[PDB]
């Protein structure tokens, strides 16, 4: 309900065997990327926040990650962002700078809301 922070269609990007490049994970197809909160117990107390990417054609979950307060966000272009949570990285190729900005507020609110509870 008020559990979702953002939902956009984008292409999931993974860091390549090269050194500093990014490529789309598998297909070049769009995925349904959402950011959401999952209550530990009480619907309004402490919770965990996840980023989830589901490929549109075969509904395969190609990305699933738990947000953490220390996470780093990187706006490279107005249409390409990538983040680092602990040791690994994921990135997104948005369809518009709009979607990108909407998603960014989303992740931002979610991160700030992480300690809501204790
Ligand atoms: Y808040």
Curated annotation (Swiss-Prot):
It is found in: Cell membrane; Membrane, Caveola; Nucleus. Residues 4-114 form the WH1 domain. Coiled coil: none annotated. Weakly expressed in embryonic cell line HEK293. Palmitoylated by ZDHHC17/HIP14. Tyrosine kinase substrate that inhibits growth-factor-mediated activation of MAP kinase. Negatively regulates hematopoiesis of bone marrow. Inhibits fibroblast growth factor (FGF)-induced retinal lens fiber differentiation, probably by inhibiting FGF-mediated phosphorylation of ERK1/2. Attenuates actin stress fiber formation via inhibition of TESK1-mediated phosphorylation of cofilin. Inhibits TGFB-induced epithelial-to-mesenchymal transition in lens epithelial cells. It is linked to Legius syndrome: An autosomal dominant syndrome characterized mainly by cafe-au-lait macules without neurofibromas or other tumor manifestations of neurofibromatosis type 1, axillary freckling, and macrocephaly. Additional clinical manifestations include Noonan-like facial dysmorphism, lipomas, learning disabilities, and features of attention deficit-hyperactivity disorder. Homodimer and heterodimer. Able to interact with SPRED2 to form heterodimers. Interacts (via C-terminus) with TAOK1/MARKK (via C-terminus); the interaction does not affect TAOK1 kinase activity. Interacts (via C-terminus) with TESK1 (via C-terminus); the interaction inhibits TESK1 kinase activity. Interacts with CAV1. Interacts with RAS. Interacts with palmitoyltransferase ZDHHC17/HIP14; the interaction leads to palmitoylation of SPRED1. This is Sprouty-related, EVH1 domain-containing protein 1. The chain holds residues 13 to 127 of 444 of the full protein.
């Amino acid at each position: 309900s008020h559990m979702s922070y953002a939902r956009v269609r984008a292409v999931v990007m993974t860091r390549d065997d090269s050194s500093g490049g990014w490529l789309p994970l598998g297909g070049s197809g769009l995925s349904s990327v959402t950011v959401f909160k999952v209550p530990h117990q009480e619907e309004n107390g402490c919770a965990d926040f996840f980023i989830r990417g589901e490929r549109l054609r075969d509904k395969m979950v190609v990305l699933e990650c738990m947000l953490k307060k220390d996470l780093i966000y990187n706006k490279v272009t107005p249409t390409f962002h990538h983040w680092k949570i602990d040791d690994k990285k994921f990135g997104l190729t948005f369809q518009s700078p709009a979607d990108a900005r909407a998603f960014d507020r989303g992740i931002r609110r979610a991160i700030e809301d992480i300690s809501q509870g204790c």
